[PDB]
Amino acid sequence: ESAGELLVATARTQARGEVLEEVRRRVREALEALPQKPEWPEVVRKLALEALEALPGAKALVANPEDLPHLEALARERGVELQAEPALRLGVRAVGAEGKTQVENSLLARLDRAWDALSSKVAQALWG
Amino acid sequence: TEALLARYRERAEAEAKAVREKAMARLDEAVALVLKEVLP
Amino acid sequence: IPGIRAQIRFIQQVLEQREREDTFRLKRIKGKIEAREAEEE
Amino acid sequence: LLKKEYTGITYISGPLLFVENAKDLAYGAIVDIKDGTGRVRGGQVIEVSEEYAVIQVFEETTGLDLATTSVSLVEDVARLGVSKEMLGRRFNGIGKPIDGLPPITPEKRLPITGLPLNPVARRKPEQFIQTGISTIDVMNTLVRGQKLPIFSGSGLPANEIAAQIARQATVRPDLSGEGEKEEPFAVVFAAMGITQRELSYFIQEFERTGALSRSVLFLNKADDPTIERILTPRMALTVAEYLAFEHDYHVLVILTDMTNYCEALREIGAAREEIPGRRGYPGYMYTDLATIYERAGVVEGKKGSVTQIPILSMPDDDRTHPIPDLTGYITEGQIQLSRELHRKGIYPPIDPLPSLSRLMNNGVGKGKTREDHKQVSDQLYSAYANGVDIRKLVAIIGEDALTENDRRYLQFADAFERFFINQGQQNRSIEESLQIAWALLSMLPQGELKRISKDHIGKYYGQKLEEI
Amino acid sequence: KKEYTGITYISGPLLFVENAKDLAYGAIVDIKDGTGRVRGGQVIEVSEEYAVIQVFEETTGLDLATTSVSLVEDVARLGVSKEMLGRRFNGIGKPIDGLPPITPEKRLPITGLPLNPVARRKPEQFIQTGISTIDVMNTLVRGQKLPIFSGSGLPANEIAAQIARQATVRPDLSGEGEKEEPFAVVFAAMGITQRELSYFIQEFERTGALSRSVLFLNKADDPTIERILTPRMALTVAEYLAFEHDYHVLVILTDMTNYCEALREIGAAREEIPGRRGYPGYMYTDLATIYERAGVVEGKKGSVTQIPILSMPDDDRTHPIPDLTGYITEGQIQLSRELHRKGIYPPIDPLPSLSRLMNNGVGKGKTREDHKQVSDQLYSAYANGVDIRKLVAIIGEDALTENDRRYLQFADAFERFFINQGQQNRSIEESLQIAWALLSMLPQGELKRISKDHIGKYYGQKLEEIWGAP
Amino acid sequence: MIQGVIQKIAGPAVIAKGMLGARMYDICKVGEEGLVGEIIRLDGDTAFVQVYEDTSGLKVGEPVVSTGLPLAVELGPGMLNGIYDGIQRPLERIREKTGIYITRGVVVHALDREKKWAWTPMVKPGDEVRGGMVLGTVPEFGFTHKILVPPDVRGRVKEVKPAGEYTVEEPVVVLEDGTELKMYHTWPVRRARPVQRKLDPNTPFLTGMRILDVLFPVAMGGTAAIPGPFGAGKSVTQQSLAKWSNADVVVYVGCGERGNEMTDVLVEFPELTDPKTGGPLMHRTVLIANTSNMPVAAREASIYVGVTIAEYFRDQGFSVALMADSTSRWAEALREISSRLEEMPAEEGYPPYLAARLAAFYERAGKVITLGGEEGAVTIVGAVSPPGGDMSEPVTQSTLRIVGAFWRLDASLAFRRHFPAINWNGSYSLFTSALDPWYRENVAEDYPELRDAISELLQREAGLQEIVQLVGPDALQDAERLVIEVGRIIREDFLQQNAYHEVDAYCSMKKAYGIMKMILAFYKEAEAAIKRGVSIDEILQLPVLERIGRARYVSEEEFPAYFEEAMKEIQGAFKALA
Amino acid sequence: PVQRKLDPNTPFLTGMRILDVLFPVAMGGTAAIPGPFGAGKSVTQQSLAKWSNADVVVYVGCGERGNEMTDVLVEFPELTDPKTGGPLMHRTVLIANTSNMPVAAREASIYVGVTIAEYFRDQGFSVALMADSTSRWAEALREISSRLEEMPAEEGYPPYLAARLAAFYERAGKVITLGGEEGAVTIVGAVSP
Ligand SMILES: Nc1ncnc2c1ncn2[C@@H]1O[C@H](COP(=O)(O)OP(=O)(O)OP(=O)(O)O)[C@@H](O)[C@H]1O
Ligand SMILES: Nc1ncnc2c1ncn2[C@@H]1O[C@H](COP(=O)(O)OP(=O)(O)OP(=O)(O)O)[C@@H](O)[C@H]1O
Ligand SMILES: [Mg+2]
């Protein structure tokens, strides 16, 4: 008798999970195309500024070679270097002065770090 | 009996599909909201 | 008999507690001396 | 947000590791430790200074090294996402689902450390609970908001009694004059180092009763890491408080074995090199157990409630062992099972002499139950104690040396043990339990009923025990 | 002669020597001061900056300016040969009999290696100790570890000397393979005083047992590390003899309690945290490394048998020393202080003793066939008579059942004849004759544990203690 | 690999340097002799290694090499019929190598690299594989040993080897990802092997003995405990467990026994022949032996190695019985190791984490559905030897807090020639309620009630033992004397069981059910006879008692007819005779 | 500070027959009531608070249950002041520091309560003070000493525990106040061994 509604609860929960993962994979696909969007050079500088202000006295900056030409002007006026790296797609990383502390700032990591907070917002929007 | 279990399975399927159809009208709006928030 | 067994258990527990406290104090002072010798130099 | 990585690990030994230059970690913050193989394990900051920080690992430190390991900050304080949709869900004792269902959408993030309730914000517990156990309802009355742990042993069936109480718990609004029919309790069940046998029994009993729809389970199995056992009661209590004080639920909280919690705390303290207590336990165990027990009760200006039934096994049946000793100094009474009654086949093997309830005077009396309740319970205590001491005397001198009144007390004690305490799985009404108590009390002359007023004796004395 | 200088810290038994990275851990060194006196020492901890050495004896005249330290051996070794028989040593292999030193056939590490368990074989042959209570009711089997539990004032040394003097094998009773093999005794004394040393010397000299014995004698005032090392020396020599020259060896260790106290002292010296009751936590492993070096090996005719001797400090069997000994060994021999005070020697108490290998080393083809049943019946009868001895004092002798007087007489006769044998040596057959004679005091049909044919074969005999069992 | 040099030697603990990157709890080889050690602490460029064996003669500056992997066992064919030490080293190879003594630094492979095996492929090229699936079958002593893909490996088959003779080391199946899978794999001993799900215990574990099976049963995948008093027959009971049980493979662990006891168990076992096939019992056993003088670390890890092997065989789809000889000695080894680490004692010197270790070890037992979809189960019967027969001892307190059954052995009953000498007081089993549905479906619909009646009869006998001691059996009332006589009948005709008899050693459930039914029928007939007037000594001489006394020693296929004859004799005898 | 201290020659009526008869307590005296859990220390102290001749009652809930203080707060305003006949709560000062409240505040609560009692004594009243549990104060001292890395003496307690206890218990006693008026302080402390 309660097992009957158990199936209803499980089915609705799995459907909600399916649609929520649909939302997350769609936003993941859209964000990966943002580097191709011409606004990406306008956002890399904001990201590097946030990463550099988050770590006072940072020694160097790490980003993709494709993004280095845009960040080069920002680096000299802040008195920091810039590093080419095969990894670190669509993001910048701020290393500490002593080489022990690092600060990572990329859109995809921010997505995971904000999903826990925004899951309720997404669910309410879907089922308001 | 088995009739009750099958009926509960069918109502569960109906509820799940209704939920999916409800969310299909705002999947795009949810994507827009999350992309807005995760963008700095 | 039960009274004697209870008294024996009581005495044993007291002795074990005293031994444990002695060991803890010994290890604590040993650690302090080791600190003064090695970290402080 | 953005994540900051510290890779300056200096010293690893046992369950603790030191990070050199991580000055920016808040005290008590949660961090994640990542090894060279990509596996991430949890941790918690227990001590932070300018020179370094001390992070205690939630599990074993196998596979960690000083070269490639990195630690990432998670949050300033341990929080938990809660919702109404938690009912019927299952978790691994750290907040992770195991039932295969997708993770829940949080309503809020609340600290598992909790906060001390303001005494002026509390209100006195008043509501009678009818558990269907005469030895509990009549003599050790339980009240909503009370915390009443169970003291048992290795082979004693404490889990069965807890499951029966969960099955049979009711409020009986009619006697109190409220008239308001109420929804059943939502049951929060927390496990600590439980075996597969006990867990299977609990799951099967909850399925048969049909209480899984209103229950939340935090399962920390016996093979699960021991350091994670610390948090499980805290998360369970956080969920219970949230439900009760933000959604007007009536919550019953069950904790399977505080003995495992205390042993894990002892191990952690011994690793921490703290001052031992009486038997190697940490000296702060009283405050730690209080931070868990004190979270029950009821709140003025709100309709919810929280009730705890912790279960613990006394080591070697010693009431003076530090675990039950420190537990009894906090909770409002306890229920101690006796191995002798279990040997004699009595079920439930509840011994009413060492048992006590410190909130019975609140929810018992005129206008709440029958007005003769307290006097009946006190007289039953007196008569049972006299019968037991007479029985102790009998073994020395033999039966024949007794007088008639002493023999009568012996007969009453035997009848009490065989009828009142022993009831099996059946469910008894409070009126039926009072009737049985009066039938037993009828065996003694009216001159012996000193504790009971004349009017109650005149109203209720004279009936026979043959009714059952 | 690689010798170091540069001492930097001396306190009690320890001293630190710097720039000694060549020193191996556990090596033995020699400490020489300015006057040429040379003290022994052992390296206990080796580090890059300095090495830590524990001095054997006191440090009266040492100093930081003129001390010199030189290596002796990377690991402790002892030269062994077939000619060590008839010699005495001070506990580190130094002769003390005044005779010229022996020729070392080979040098062996005293820390012996564990035996391979699949190589071992079941003990099957007994040893005649010459004591009735031990040879009959608590038989000692070749390859056993049967400690003798003693009191404080009880005379254990006399028992040890008597066993060393009277122990021998009985190849005759084996029936087949009637040919004797060499027998030897290894004696280890730890923490004895001058008087006990003199007594042992005299006992081994007056009878001539020195011709088949090796003595390792260590005094109470000797250095502690020597007391620690002595049993390892004795067991190394015993193993060499037994498993190289086909010798049957019996090793007697005296006062394992003194060894335990020395172990406690050394553990406290190394700044190691004491375990339960103040003894080292590794005490069980250290004792197992000594006891477990005896047994019998497939394909070899030799054997090693151990009889540890220890006195319970406060008569407490739950004291850690006898408790761990009981964990490791296969029985015990209990000395009764009442028997000692009543003038009975040797004061062995049959009721609280036990031999766990007894059943497998006696019977057909090994000893006289009726051994086990006689032992069981004697034990039961003595236990039955002991309580009657106490009940008589309250109910009176005239009120006893007729069999109770016979049990009283049997207990008295057993005490006065079986246990109280004095210094005389007894054969196994003579001991069994005495046992049957004592059993003849009881009515036939009260012997529930003995087969009827054995009763018919051996019943009907008067006391043989007066006769001497010809 | 990561290589360093010695900086400081002090006892079994050695400090290394230049080892930045070494992982915790990983096995290191110290010195030219290659002594194995384990890392316990890391700080700076320094690793703290605990050498297993002795460290005499070592010098500062010797090389130290870390293997990069923790302690682990090799899982594959050839582990049957074998003898292993604490860390899974074949003792027979060691004997054939270094003689009768064990030298430090011996290197041998737990699985022989020289033997050939008959490979039988099961997979096909291009198949998807996942951890737990069967790759092939290799015959071994009448068993179909299935090679299992390692649990963590998931991929697709590329190359398969044809059927034939191959050695253990030869790679047989190569996956498309470049990973090579061979006849054996490796598993860390301190991580339990994964499974799909743990089923609840619902079927009995047939121990072959009436008392154990009927009064204090243990289910498949449960746990038990048993004291070890001397002269009580513990070894015989364990041997009968190894011989007559349901378990397909038997695993025995010696974890700190005496040398002579180990010799006894290693000599008795080769002469045993199981009733299943008549072949040597050693073909179904894995012996793990340890003497007290062996290194402490091996004694500590012996139980983990044994339980990991049992887990492997359970994953293979068998039912395994695992016996630990004395967990007290393992606890002593653990206490000594903890004392080496300078850890604060908790109680009686024992470390605080002892209860956690015992619980984690005991939880590995259970009945599961393996990763391959088959069914397997492991049952643990671990004996505990208290110091002086005291159960307040912390090890017994911890163990009795988690096990599902307890078998109180006693020396007094064995002294009275009652075998097995297992007391019915203090002994308890928690599996009876769960086994009641199975008993109803399997043996009889009334078996639980019959067992309860037997238990109540025993309790009635025990409730008046003081009067008989005071008075005596000859001078008693009819009811009490009949109760005590029926109790003695029960004790000597249903609880006792001869281990060395040809047909009495093994008893099924139906045989015991018949015994109990006959006993109850006799008791009710005797009560009716007393009610209508009879003397007890008239009852004693009925032939039904002599028939029940010989209810044992009958064939298990002859039991139905004998039971029917006994029932008819019981019903007819008490009407023709008073 | 006080002017002079006097000997106690007046009884302190606690309203219990056994305590008022067999083991009396004086106005300026001190009493200790130890016992196991469930013995009834709290009930006794609450009964003393309800039925006593003292002018002002100060209750210190040092490290005990919050429900105990909640019940007192709920029920006292309906009771009767034994002497003045007004509400009972008008004469009571409650200092509550429950078990889940910060540990280090247990030590400060005792001193705050005793200082308030001394002030009311200096005003010229006869004040009774109840300490709910000094064992919790001892535990707080032990915890702080552990944090200070001090050397333990007995069950981990710091060696200066008895000095603090004596200093706390010596603030009691009937005195002549600096204003020439008369007053006294009565201290009844519970111990949880
Ligand atoms: N079930 C049994 N049936 C018949 N004889 C038995 C049985 N159990 C034990 N015995 C007898 O006991 C002998 C071995 O068991 P015993 O009572 O001597 O103790 P044990 O197994 O050696 O004890 P432990 O291992 O505790 O030291 C057997 O050879 C046999 O004579
Ligand atoms: N004088 C009394 N009259 C009636 N009941 C009493 C009395 N003293 C104690 N009790 C009973 O004792 C219980 C309350 O005890 P109380 O809380 O005072 O104990 P305590 O010794 O202060 O314990 P703790 O130290 O654990 O706080 C109730 O069940 C109450 O009925
Ligand atoms: Mg209180």
Residue numbers in the entry:
A (entry chain L): 61 to 188
B (entry chain K): 81 to 120
C (entry chain G): 169 to 209
D (entry chain E): 3 to 470
E (entry chain D): 5 to 474
F (entry chain B): 1 to 578
G (entry chain C): 194 to 386
Q: Can I see the authors' text?
A:
When powered by ATP hydrolysis, the V1 domain rotates the central rotor against the A3B3 hexamer, composed of three catalytic AB dimers adopting different conformations (ABopen, ABsemi, and ABclosed). Here, we report the atomic models of 18 catalytic intermediates of the V1 domain of V/A-ATPase under different reaction conditions, determined by single particle cryo-EM.
We determined three rotational states followed by focused refinement using a V1EG mask for each state. In these structures, nucleotide densities have been identified in the three catalytic sites.
